Amino acid sequence: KNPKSDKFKVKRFHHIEFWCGDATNVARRFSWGLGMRFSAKSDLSTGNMVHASYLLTSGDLRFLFTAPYSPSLSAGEIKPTTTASIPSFDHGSCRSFFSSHGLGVRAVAIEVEDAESAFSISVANGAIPSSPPIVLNEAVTIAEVKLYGDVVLRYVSYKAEFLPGFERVEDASSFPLDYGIRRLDHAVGNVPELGPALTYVAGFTGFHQFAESGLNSAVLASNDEMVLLPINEPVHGTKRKSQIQTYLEHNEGAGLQHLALMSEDIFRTLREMRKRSSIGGFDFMPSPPPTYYQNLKKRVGDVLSDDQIKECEELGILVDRDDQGTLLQIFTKPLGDRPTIFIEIIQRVGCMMYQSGGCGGFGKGNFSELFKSIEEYEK
Amino acid sequence: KNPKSDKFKVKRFHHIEFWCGDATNVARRFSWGLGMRFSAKSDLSTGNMVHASYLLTSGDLRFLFTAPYSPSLSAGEIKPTTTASIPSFDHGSCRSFFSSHGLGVRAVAIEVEDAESAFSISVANGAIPSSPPIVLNEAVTIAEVKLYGDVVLRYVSYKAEFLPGFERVEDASSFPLDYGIRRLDHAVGNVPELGPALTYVAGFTGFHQFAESGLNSAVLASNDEMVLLPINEPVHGTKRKSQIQTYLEHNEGAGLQHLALMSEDIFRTLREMRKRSSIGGFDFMPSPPPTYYQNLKKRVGDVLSDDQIKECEELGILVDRDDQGTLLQIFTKPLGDRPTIFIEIIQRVGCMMYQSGGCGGFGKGNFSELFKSIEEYEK
Numbered sequence: 001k002n003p004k005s006d007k008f009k010v011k012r013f014h015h016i017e018f019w020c021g022d023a024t025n026v027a028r029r030f031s032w033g034l035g036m037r038f039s040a041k042s043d044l045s046t047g048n049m050v051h052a053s054y055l056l057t058s059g060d061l062r063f064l065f066t067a068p069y070s071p072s073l074s075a076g077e078i079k080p081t082t083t084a085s086i087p088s089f090d091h092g093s094c095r096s097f098f099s100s101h102g103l104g105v106r107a108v109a110i111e112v113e114d115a116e117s118a119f120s121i122s123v124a125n126g127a128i129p130s131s132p133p134i135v136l137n138e139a140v141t142i143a144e145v146k147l148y149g150d151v152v153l154r155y156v157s158y159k160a161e162f163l164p165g166f167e168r169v170e171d172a173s174s175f176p177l178d179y180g181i182r183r184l185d186h187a188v189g190n191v192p193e194l195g196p197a198l199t200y201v202a203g204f205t206g207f208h209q210f211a212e213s214g215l216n217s218a219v220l221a222s223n224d225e226m227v228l229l230p231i232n233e234p235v236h237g238t239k240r241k242s243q244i245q246t247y248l249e250h251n252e253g254a255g256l257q258h259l260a261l262m263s264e265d266i267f268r269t270l271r272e273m274r275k276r277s278s279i280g281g282f283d284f285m286p287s288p289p290p291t292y293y294q295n296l297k298k299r300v301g302d303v304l305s306d307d308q309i310k311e312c313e314e315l316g317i318l319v320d321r322d323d324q325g326t327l328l329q330i331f332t333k334p335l336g337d338r339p340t341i342f343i344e345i346i347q348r349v350g351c352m353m354y355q356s357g358g359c360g361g362f363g364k365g366n367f368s369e370l371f372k373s374i375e376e377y378e379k
Numbered sequence: 380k381n382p383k384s385d386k387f388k389v390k391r392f393h394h395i396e397f398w399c400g401d402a403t404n405v406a407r408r409f410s411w412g413l414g415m416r417f418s419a420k421s422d423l424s425t426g427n428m429v430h431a432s433y434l435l436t437s438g439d440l441r442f443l444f445t446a447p448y449s450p451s452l453s454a455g456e457i458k459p460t461t462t463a464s465i466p467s468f469d470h471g472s473c474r475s476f477f478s479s480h481g482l483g484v485r486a487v488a489i490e491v492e493d494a495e496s497a498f499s500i501s502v503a504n505g506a507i508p509s510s511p512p513i514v515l516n517e518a519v520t521i522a523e524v525k526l527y528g529d530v531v532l533r534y535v536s537y538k539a540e541f542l543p544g545f546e547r548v549e550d551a552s553s554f555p556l557d558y559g560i561r562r563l564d565h566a567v568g569n570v571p572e573l574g575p576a577l578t579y580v581a582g583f584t585g586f587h588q589f590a591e592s593g594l595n596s597a598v599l600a601s602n603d604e605m606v607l608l609p610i611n612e613p614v615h616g617t618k619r620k621s622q623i624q625t626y627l628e629h630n631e632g633a634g635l636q637h638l639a640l641m642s643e644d645i646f647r648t649l650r651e652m653r654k655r656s657s658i659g660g661f662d663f664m665p666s667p668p669p670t671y672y673q674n675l676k677k678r679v680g681d682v683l684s685d686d687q688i689k690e691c692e693e694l695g696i697l698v699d700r701d702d703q704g705t706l707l708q709i710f711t712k713p714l715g716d717r718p719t720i721f722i723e724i725i726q727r728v729g730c731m732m733y734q735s736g737g738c739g740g741f742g743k744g745n746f747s748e749l750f751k752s753i754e755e756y757e758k
C-alpha cells in the first residue's frame with residue numbers, strides 16, 4: 001500500500017554531510033576504507049575562510065566532510081559577504097554538534113524539484129526550520145529543516161558542480177578508488193520515542209510508512225520509495241541492553257544510527273574493505289557462526305548457489321528475504337570513537353520492473369536468525 | 380660548546396600526544412600514511428569512561444591520539460575515582476584546545492629519571508605547572524609543565540606497558556606496517572617572540588643552545604643532545620609573508636610546528652609514503668627543481684653517489700650539510716585542515732662515535748639553496 005502522498009516532488013538522496021573536527025583526516029580515512037575518490041573541495045585554497053569541506057564520491061554516493069576554521073579568519077565577514085560555500089554553516093553550531101555528539105551525520109540531503117517550495121510546504125506542515133532557502137550563484141537552491149536530534153533534512157534543487165564555490169579536485173590527488181559502492185540505499189535515525197518522531201517527519205513530508213531484541217522501528221518512504229528513512233526507538237527492560245539506548249546515551253540523544261550503502265557487487269566490496277580493515281579502513285561486526293550459513297540453504301537455496309553461499313560465509317555476509325526479494329547485508333563496527341554511527345553494506349536481489357526500492361526489506365529477520373544460529377551453534 | 384647544564388636527568392623523547400576530536404579516524408589515517416602499527420589502547424573497552432586514547436608505534440617512535448567522550452559517561456567520577464588512564468586529561472581543556480587550534484600536538488613527552496623531581500626542579504626554576512606529578516599503579520610517574528602556547532612538556536619516569544591502564548592491541552587489529560621510521564629526532568615550536576620563549580624553557584630545563592626568508596630560530600638541547608627542541612619566531616615586513624606568521628594566525632597563537640621523524644632508510648620511507656599520498660596517506664611539499672639536484676653534486680658529491688643523488692631527485696628529498704655531518708630531509712604538507720602542523724622525514728649521515736645528536740644540523744642552508752635553485756631553474 002503506497003498512497004503516494006509526498007507533499008512536494010522528491011527525487012533521490014543527494015549527499016550525506018558529516019560534521020568533523022578535522023575534515024581532512026576523516027575524509028582520507030573514509031576514502032581508503034570505502035573506496036571513494038576525492039572529487040570536490042571548498043576550503044582555504046578555494047577562497048573559503050569559514051569551513052573546510054571535502055567531497056568523496058563512489059558512483060552516485062556523495063559523502064561530504066566539513067569542519068570549521070578559526071572564526072578569526074572570517075571575523076570581518078557578515079552573511080551578505082560570506083566566503084562560506086554552504087551558507088547554512090555556523091561555527092558555533094558545528095563545534096556544539098561535534099562536542100555533543102562526536103563525529104556524525106549533520107545533514108541527510110535529498111534532491112527535490114524546488115527547494116524553496118519544499119521548505120515552505122514542509123514548515124507549513126509542521127517542520128521546524130533550520131536554514132531558510134538560499135540561492136547559490138543563481139544555480140542551486142539549498143534549505144534545511146530539523147529531522148531528529150541535531151540532524152537536518154537538507155533540500156537541494158538545481159535549475160539545470162556539486163555546489164557553487166566547490167572546485168573539482170586535481171587529478172594528481174583524486175586516485176580512482178572503487179570497491180563497488182554505488183548509492184545510498186537508506187539512512188536510519190535513533191530516537192527516544194518512535195511515535196512522535198514518525199508523526200513529525202511524515203507530517204511535513206507526506207512520506208508514507210513502507211511495507212524481542214532491542215528496538216521498535218518503522219520506515220518512511222517517498223513516492224517511488226527511493227528515499228527511505230527508517231527510525232528506531234529502544235525497548236527497555238530486556239535481558240540484553242538495547243543498542244538503541246546505548247546509542248542515545250553515548251550520542252547525547254537522537255541522531256543518525258547507520259547509513260546503508262548499496263553495492264553493485266557486495267562480494268567484491270567486502271573483499272576490498274576487509275583487506276583494509278587493519279590498515280586504516282573499517283572493521284566489521286563479528287561474523288555469524290557456521291550454523292547461520294548451514295541454515296542459509298533452507299532459506300535462500302533457490303536464490304544463491306552453494307558457491308555463492310559459502311562466499312557469504314567467508315565474508316561474514318548476512319542474508320534475509322521478503323515476499324518480493326532477497327537482501328545481502330553486513331554491518332561495520334562504529335565509524336569513530338563512540339558506539340554510535342556505523343555503516344551497512346547492502347545488495348538487493350529481485351523486484352525488477354529497474355529495481356523497486358526496498359526490495360527484500362531491511363533485514364529485520366536477521367535478529368531472530370542470528371540469535372537462532374548463536375544457540376544452535378552452541379549446542 | 381655543550382655546558383651540560385640539564386637541571387635533572389633527561390633520557391630520550393618518549394611520546395607525542397595529539398589532541399583530536401575523533402581519535403579513531405586520525406589514528407587510522409596516520410597509521411596507514413606513516414607505517415605505524417597500533418600497539419596500545421585505553422578506551423571504553425578497557426574501562427576508560429573519560430577519553431579514547433590510541434597508541435601507534437614505529438621503532439622507538441610513539442604517537443598517541445586522544446579525544447574526549449561525552450562528559451556524561453563519567454559525570455559521577457571525581458579525580459580520586461577517575462577511570463581516565465591519563466590523569467592530566469580534562470574534557471574542557473581538550474575541547475578548548477581542539478576548537479582553538481584544530482588537530483595538533485598537546486604534549487611533547489620526554490622520559491626522565493624522576494618525573495616528580497623534574498617537575499619540582501622545573502617549577503622552582505620558572506616553569507608554569509600544568510599537571511602535578513601523579514603516580515600510576517605505583518609504577519609510572521607523569522607530570523606536565525607549560526612549554527609554549529597550549530603545548531605541555533610532559534615528564535614520564537618508570538620505576539622498572541606504555542602506561543598503566545593501557546592494554547596491548549589484539550593481533551588481528553595491529554597489522555605490522557613499517558616504512559622505516561624509527562624515532563623522533565626533534566620537535567619544533569612556533570612562537571611570536573623567540574627571545575622570551577628561549578629564556579623561559581632554557582630557564583627551567585637547563586637545556587643549552589645547540590651549535591632573509593621568514594624566521595629566526597634557535598635550538599635547545601639536553602646534555603647528550605638527544606632531546607632537541609628548536610623554536611621559531613616570524614620575521615615581519617618581508618616580501619613573501621612569513622610562514623611562521625601564517626601558522627600563528629591559523630593556529631590561534633603559538634604551538635608545535637613540525638615533528639621530525641628519523642628514518643633508518645629515507646629512500647624506502649619516502650617510496651612507501653608517496654605510494655600512499657593519494658589513497659589516505661600524506662602529501663609532500665612541491666619538489667625542488669632539477670637545478671637543485673644538479674647543484675647537489677658540488678655540495679655533497681663526496682657523500683652521495685650519482686645514483687643516490689638521482690634517487691633523491693625522484694623522491695624530492697632535500698640535502699644539507701654541517702661541518703660535521705650530512706642531512707637528508709623532506710617536508711609533508713600540513714597534517715590536517717589548517718596550514719599549521721606538518722611532519723619532516725629525516726636521515727643523518729656522519730658524526731659516529733652511535734651517532735651524536737643533531738648530526739648535520741636542521742637544514743637551514745636549504746632556504747638559500749632552494750631559492751637559488753628556483754631562480755637558476757627559471758633562467
Ligand SMILES: Cc1c(C(=O)C2=C(O)CCCC2=O)ccc2ncn(-c3ccccc3)c(=O)c12
Nearest residue numbers: 188217230232285331344362363364366367370
Ligand atoms: C542494523 C540492523 C538492521 C538494519 O539495518 C535496520 C534497518 O535498516 C531498519 C529497521 C531496523 C534495523 O535494525 C537489520 C538487522 C540487523 N540485525 C542484526 N544487527 C546486529 C548484529 C550484530 C550486533 C548488533 C546488531 C543489526 O545491527 C541489524
Ligand SMILES: Cc1c(C(=O)C2=C(O)CCCC2=O)ccc2ncn(-c3ccccc3)c(=O)c12
Nearest residue numbers: 567596609611664710723741742743745746749
Ligand atoms: C621546516 C624547514 C626546516 C626545519 O626543519 C627547521 C628546523 O627543524 C629548526 C630550524 C628552523 C627550521 O626551519 C629547514 C629547512 C627548510 N627549508 C625549506 N622549508 C620550506 C620548503 C618549502 C616551502 C616552505 C618551507 C622548510 O620548511 C624548512
Ligand SMILES: [Co+2]
Nearest residue numbers: 188260344362
Ligand atoms: Co539497514
Ligand SMILES: [Co+2]
Nearest residue numbers: 567639723741
Ligand atoms: Co626540522
